[PDB]
Amino acid sequence: SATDLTEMVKKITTMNRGEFRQITLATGAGKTTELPRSVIEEIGRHKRVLVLIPLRAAAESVYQYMRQKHPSIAFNLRIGEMKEGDMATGITYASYGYFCQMSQPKLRAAMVEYSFIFLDEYHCATPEQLAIMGKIHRFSENLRVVAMTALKCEKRIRLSPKMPFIVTGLKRMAVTKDYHYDLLQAQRYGIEDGINITKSFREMNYDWSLYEEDSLMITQLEILNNLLISEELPMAVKNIMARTDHPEPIQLAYNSYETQVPVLFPKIRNGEVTDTYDNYTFLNARKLGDDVPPYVYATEDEDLAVELLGLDWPDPGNQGTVEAGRALKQVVG
């Protein structure tokens, strides 16, 4: 009721910079909604508060609702292009993806200017959400952060010391969370900054205690993430990733440690190899044929085609890739 909200607001409003609070708001309303509203009415209307929402549509929807409901409070929406030198005063409703456009120093300069940062629906664990949480935690000392919470076919990952070290693919499962695939995709958000997103996630989760952890999986993912950012990404690969409609461009970034040429593996209908190939834009790819590429990162179907055809994946071809393999073997052992 109002008794528990006033206590929650007073606990939030008295937080010092460098502090974190987790909130479970089971009933009502809420969250998104009345919590940052009550916080801003307490700290002052011209102070800045950020509310991070996973879906862009959900952000626009809260923004519309709140601005009509509370005309006395200023509201801002950030779901498109970066508003350069943004200093807008009320509650800012932004998607996590909006902040994924910023470099680490730009991100910090933007973030520190908010009195409070509300991480809404953290349980969704989207790649933009996982990247932002890990990235902002790197300067958490400078922030007041509050995390709030209320069959199907999904991508899963397999990790091994035998190359391809990463294998991703759809899996049949019950309904709503396994965030490993989203964590792997989130890694793309630290390439340009030379940030290990896995390390940032592990460090954030140790302080914030938001997610359950599979220690072996995190350790393996962190070893692979170090390989990912070990060298500057080639400009040719950077351009392809920025422009392709490929569902996992990070595959291009991981594979560049062995090959610059993407390969088109024949599609699998039922449990058999077809004369069909999935062609994505900007790749300038060759078909598999009988020459299997030295992939670090493969898809379940790419691996399946290799098996069905009687082919073998190559072994690590350089020091870096041989070392990732022995590090992964040590960790499993």
Task: Give the CA count within 13 Å in the CB-facing half-sphere of 190.
Answer: 30
Partnered with residue 169 across adjacent β-strands are 156
Cα(205)–Cα(256) distance, rounded to whole angstroms?
30
User: Under 8 Å CB-to-CB from 142, ≥6 apart: which residues?
Assistant: 17, 18, 108, 111, 112
A 10 A CB-CB count for 303 gives 18
User: Under 8 Å CB-to-CB from 57, ≥6 apart: which residues?
Assistant: none
- Tokens representing residue 166 in the block: 């990463």
Q: Which of 122, 55, 123, 66 lies closest to 90, judged by CA?
A: 66
Using DSSP, state whether 9 is helix, strand or coil: helix
Known binding-site residue numbers for ATP: 25-32
Q: Are strands 166-173 and 152-159 parallel, antiparallel or unpaired?
A: antiparallel
Cα(82)–Cα(99) distance, rounded to whole angstroms?
8
Cα pseudo-dihedral 221, 227, 233, 239, rounded to 10 = -30
H or E element, residue 104: helix 104-111
Strand order in the sheet with 166-173: 152-159, 166-173, 297-299
C-alpha distances (whole Å) from 5 to each of 92, 169, 180, 302 are 21, 43, 34, 52
Any idea what DSSP says for residue 238? H
Resolution of this model in Å is 2.5
Are the beta carbons of 111 and 118 closer than 8 angstroms?
no
Using DSSP, state whether 330 is helix, strand or coil: helix
- List phi, psi (to 5°) of 301: -70, -30
The experimental technique behind this entry is: X-ray
The secondary structure of 24-85 as a DSSP string is E--SSS-SSSHHHHHHHHHH-TTS-EEEEESSHHHHHHHHHHHHHH-TTS-EEEESSS--TT
Cα(170)–Cα(193) distance, rounded to whole angstroms?
30
User: Under 8 Å CB-to-CB from 52, ≥6 apart: which residues?
Assistant: 94, 95, 96, 99, 117, 118, 119, 120, 129, 132
Exposure pattern of 15-32 as b/e (b: 16+ CB <10 Å)? beeeebeeeebeeeeebb
Any idea what DSSP says for residue 102? S
C-alpha distances (whole Å) from 228 to each of 24, 175, 236, 318 are 36, 32, 16, 14
Are the beta carbons of 227 and 324 closer than 8 angstroms?
yes
Are the beta carbons of 15 and 144 closer than 8 angstroms?
yes
Beta strand extents in the chain (DSSP E only): 19-24, 49-53, 75-78, 91-95, 116-120, 144-149, 152-159, 166-173, 263-264, 266-269, 272-277, 286-287, 297-299
Any idea what DSSP says for residue 16? P
Cα(86)–Cα(90) distance, rounded to whole angstroms?
12
Any idea what DSSP says for residue 280? P
Amino acid at 298: A
CA dihedral sign, ordered 265, 268, 273, 279: negative
Using DSSP, state whether 229 is helix, strand or coil: coil
Residues, the chain: 333
- Tokens representing residue 205 in the block: 């989760």
- Tokens representing residue 2 in the block: 């109002």
Residue with tokens 């990952």: 157
Cα(119)–Cα(44) distance, rounded to whole angstroms?
20
The secondary structure of 184-211 as a DSSP string is HHHGGGGTTTT--HHHHHHHHHHHH--S
Partnered with residue 263 across adjacent β-strands are 286
Q: Are strands 286-287 and 152-159 parallel, antiparallel or unpaired?
A: unpaired
Residue 272: exposed, middle, or buried by beta-carbon count in 10 A (0-12, 13-18, 19+)?
exposed
A 10 A CB-CB count for 75 gives 23
CA dihedral sign, ordered 301, 302, 307, 308: positive
Residue with tokens 């959400």: 129
H or E element, residue 307: helix 300-308
Using DSSP, state whether 22 is helix, strand or coil: strand
Are the beta carbons of 50 and 92 closer than 8 angstroms?
yes
Residue 164, preceding bond cis, omega within 30 degrees?
yes
Task: Write the residues followed by a gap in the chain (C–N more than 2.5 A).
Answer: 150, 176
Known binding-site residue numbers: 25-32
Cα(226)–Cα(206) distance, rounded to whole angstroms?
19
